[PDB]
Amino acid sequence: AQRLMQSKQTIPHYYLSIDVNMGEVLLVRKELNKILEGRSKISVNDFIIKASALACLKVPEANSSWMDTVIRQNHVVDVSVAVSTPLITPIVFNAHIKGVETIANDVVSLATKAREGKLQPHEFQGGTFTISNLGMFGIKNFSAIINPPQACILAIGASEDKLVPADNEKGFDVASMMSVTLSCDHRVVDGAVGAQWLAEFRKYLEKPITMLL
Amino acid sequence: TGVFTDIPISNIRRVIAQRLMQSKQTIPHYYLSIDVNMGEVLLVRKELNKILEGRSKISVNDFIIKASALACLKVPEANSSWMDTVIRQNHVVDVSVAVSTPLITPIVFNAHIKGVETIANDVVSLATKAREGKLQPHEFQGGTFTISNLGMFGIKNFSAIINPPQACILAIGASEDKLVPADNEKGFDVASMMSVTLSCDHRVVDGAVGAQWLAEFRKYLEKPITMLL
Amino acid sequence: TGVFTDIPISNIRRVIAQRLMQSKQTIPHYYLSIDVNMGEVLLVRKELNKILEGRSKISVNDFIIKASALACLKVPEANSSWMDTVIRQNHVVDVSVAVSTPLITPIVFNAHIKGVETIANDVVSLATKAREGKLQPHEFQGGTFTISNLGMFGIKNFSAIINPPQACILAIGASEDKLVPADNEKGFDVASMMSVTLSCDHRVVDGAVGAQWLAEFRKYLEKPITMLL
Amino acid sequence: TGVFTDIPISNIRRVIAQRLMQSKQTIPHYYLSIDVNMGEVLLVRKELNKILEGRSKISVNDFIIKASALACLKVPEANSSWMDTVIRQNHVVDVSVAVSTPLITPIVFNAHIKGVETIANDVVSLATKAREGKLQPHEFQGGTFTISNLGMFGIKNFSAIINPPQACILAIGASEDKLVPADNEKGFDVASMMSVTLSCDHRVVDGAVGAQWLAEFRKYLEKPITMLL
C-alpha cells in the first residue's frame, strides 16, 4: 500500500493502448508445443515476455528509471511478472537473451517457489520492467499503476474473437484480438516513443519469426 | 622459359602451413556426414529478407551460424578443446568463419546469444575489414569453432582439416535439387539438399555425440522456428 | 561461472586416446565406399523373425557380421595384420563390434563359422555384460576386424580411424529411401540404401583388393541366400 | 594349419610402404568431391570410336587424362610440388596413371599437348610394357600428377593418399544412373554420374583453387567440344 500510494502520488502516469492480432502466435505456439514431447508446456505469456524484452532493446527509453539527478538507462533487460497470489512478483532475469522455452521454465520454477513457498528477497526487487496479465479472469482491458523504481507497466487483456473486414467472398473473417495497454512515467517516455515501443511489440507478435532477427 | 619455375615460399603461407602440418600430425581426425533439407530455411530467408527494407541482406550462412552455435550448447563436448592435462569445456560460443582470400578468418563473438541479423552484419563488417584491409590480430585467434563453406564454388562435399586449439570443423557443400520419394500422385518431389560434413578430434568427441551434435544441427535447420526455443 | 571450465582427463580416455593418436600417426589410412541395396535382407529378416517364436530377435547388424566374415574368407588380405617383420594373415575370423557406451568393444569369436542367430545372441549377451557390467579383459583384445555402425543416430556416411593391430574398419551409415531407375510404367522405384565405408591399412590392402572385398560383401548382402554356399 | 600364418614382407612392398607411410605422415591431406554428368562424353566417345576403323579403341579414361591436364593449365597451383625452400610450379604437364597390378604406374608424358588418341595408345603401350614385362625406372618417377580410377571394380567413391613429390590425386568412381529433375512431362530423367574426388597438399592448394580446378575439369567434361579451345 505504501508502494502504491507513493508511486501514484509521484509518477505522472499515462495510458497508451493497442490491439494485437494473435493468430500467428497461436499457430507457432501450437506447433512448438507439438514438437516438444510434452517435456514442457509453453504459454502465450512467454511470447509476451520475449517480445516485450526485445522491444525494450529497440526503444531503450521505455526500459529506463527516473533517478532525481539523472535518468538511468540500463542495457540489460530484467522483466518482473505480476502473478496474483492469495501479489507475488518473480523476476525473469536477462530475458533479452534467453530463449522462449527457458523463459517458460524459469517462470514456472519461479511460480512454484512463490505460490506455496517462500522466495528469497532478491527476487522481489522489481528490476527494470513489469508484465501483468488478467485475461484469464476475463477482463477485457485495464490500466495498472506502476512500482516506482520503474517507468512502465504492460497490462494484458483477454484474447477475443472479433469480425474484421476481409477480401474474400463473405467480405469478412474472424480474428483473435488482445487488447494491450501500456502505462508510462512521462518524464522519461514522451508519447511518440511510448508509441514506438508499442509498435515494435506489435510487430514481434504479429509476425513471430522476426523474433529470430 | 623452361620445364619448371620457382617462387619463394611466403611467410604467412609458412605460418598457415605450420598450423596445418602440426594439426594433421597430432589430432586424430574423423569425418561424419549428413544431408540437410534446406527448403524451409529458404522460405524463412526469403520472408525475413522481404520484411527487411533491404536495409540488410541475410544469407543462408547466418542460419548456419545460429544453428551450429545453439547445437554447441545442446551438446557441449563438440564445442571444447584438448589441453594435455585436462579437457577444457567452454560455456560461451565463439565461431570463426573460414573466408577465402587471395585464408582470412574473422571470428563472430558470442554467437550463441546474438540474433541472426546482427550475426549477418557482424560477418559482413568483418569481411570488409578483411578482404581489402588489415584486421587486428585479436580477430585471428581461432576461438572455439569453425564453419567453412564451399558451396559457392560448386563443391558437392568436402572434408577439411582443423586448427589445433579447436576440436571440430563444419564444412558445407553446395545446395542441390534431388528427387526424394513423396506421397502425391506423381510419387515424388524435388528437394533442396545440402551435404554437411563435420570433422572431430575423437579424443574428446566419441562418435555417438558427434552424431548427436549433427542431429540437433539438422533439426534447427529442418525446422527453423525451433531456433526460438 | 566463467567463460570456460575444466575437468580432469579420464584414465581410460587416455588409453583410448593413445590408441587413436598412435594409429592415426602410423597406419596410412584410406577410404573406400559403396551403396548396398538392403531390400532383400529386409525380407529375409522379417521372415526369420516371423519363424522364430519371438524366442530371439534378429537385427540387420547380424547379417552385417555374417557377410563381412565370409568376405574376409573370400579375400584374405583385408583380414590380416601388419607386423614389422612379416605380414600376418589369419585363417580364423574374429570380429569386434564397436558399441557406443557412456566405447566398449565386445568381440564375436569365430564368426566365420557360427550361424546368424547364434551371432545375434552372442552380441546381445556380450552387450549385457558390457553396458552396465564389467567384462573380462580378454574380450577387449581387438581381434582381427571391426564393424562400427551409426545408422541409429541418423549419420548418412562416415569414415572411422582403425585400432593398430588390425588393418581395416567397416563403418555403416543409416538406411534410406532413394528413387532408383526402373523398367515399369512409372519409370522408377523406391529402394533401401545403406552407405558402407571401409578403411584400410594400404601397406597390406592395395586398392583393387579392398574393392574386391567390398564386392563380395555387396553380393552376400544383395543376394542373401548365397550366404548358404 | 593353425589360427594364423605368416609370409615375409616383400621388398617392393616395403618401398611402396615407405612412400605411403612417409607421405601420409607429412603432407596435410584434404578431400574435395564433385559429380560429373558423363552423357555427352559418352556420345562423343561412341562417335570417335565409330569413325576410327577399330584401328584403335578409345576409353573414357583418355578424356579423363586430356581434361585433367588442360585444367592443370588453367589453374597451375594444383599442378605444382612442395619443396622445402620454395614452391616449384611446372609449366609442362606429366600425368601418371595408377594402374593396378598383381601397383605399376606408367607416366603419360606431356599430356597437356598430345591429342586424345595418342594418349590412349600411349597408355596401352605403357600397360603392355608393365603388366607382364619390365619397365625402365625412368617411367616410375611420379611426374607432376596422378589419376587413379576404380570404377571397374564398382567402388562408388574413394579418397586416395598421394605420393610425396606431388601435391594431388584424382580418384575416379564408378559411373552410375541417377534420376535427376527435368522439365518434360514426366518431370525427370536418367543421367550418368561419375563421382570424382580430389586430394590436395593444402600448403600449396587453398580450398577455393582446388575448387576452381575441379570446376574447369567439370566443364571440359560436361561440354567436351571445349577441349578444342
From Swiss-Prot, chain A:
The modification N6-acetyllysine is found at K34. This is Dihydrolipoyllysine-residue acetyltransferase component of pyruvate dehydrogenase complex, mitochondrial. Part of the pyruvate dehydrogenase complex (PDHc) that is a multi-enzyme complex composed of multiple copies of three enzymes, pyruvate dehydrogenase (subunits PDH1A and PDHB, E1 component), dihydrolipoamide acetyltransferase (DLAT, E2 component), and dihydrolipoamide dehydrogenase (DLD, E3 component) to which is added an additional protein the E3-binding protein (PDHX, E3BP). In terms of structural architecture, the E2 and E3BP components assemble into a 60meric central core with icosahedral symmetry. The central core is decorated with E1 and E3 proteins. Transmembrane segments: none annotated. The keyword Transport does not apply. GO terms for molecular function: dihydrolipoyllysine-residue acetyltransferase activity; identical protein binding. The lineage of its organism: Eukaryota, Metazoa, Chordata, Craniata, Vertebrata. As part of the pyruvate dehydrogenase complex, catalyzes the transfers of an acetyl group to a lipoic acid moiety. The pyruvate dehydrogenase complex, catalyzes the overall conversion of pyruvate to acetyl-CoA and CO(2), and thereby links cytoplasmic glycolysis and the mitochondrial tricarboxylic acid (TCA) cycle. The active site is at H186, D190. One of its GO terms (biological process) is tricarboxylic acid cycle. The modification N6-succinyllysine is found at K41, K113. Belongs to the 2-oxoacid dehydrogenase family. One of its GO terms (cellular component) is pyruvate dehydrogenase complex. It comes from Homo sapiens (Human). It is found in: Mitochondrion matrix. The keyword Cell division does not apply. Keywords: Acetylation, Acyltransferase, Carbohydrate metabolism, Glucose metabolism, Lipoyl, Mitochondrion, Phosphoprotein, Repeat, Transferase, Transit peptide, Tricarboxylic acid cycle. CoA binds at R29, S43, S132, N133, G157. The gene is DLAT. It comes from the Eukaryota. It is linked to Primary biliary cirrhosis is a chronic, progressive cholestatic liver disease characterized by the presence of antimitochondrial autoantibodies in patients' serum. It manifests with inflammatory obliteration of intra-hepatic bile duct, leading to liver cell damage and cirrhosis. Patients with primary biliary cirrhosis show autoantibodies against the E2 component of pyruvate dehydrogenase complex.
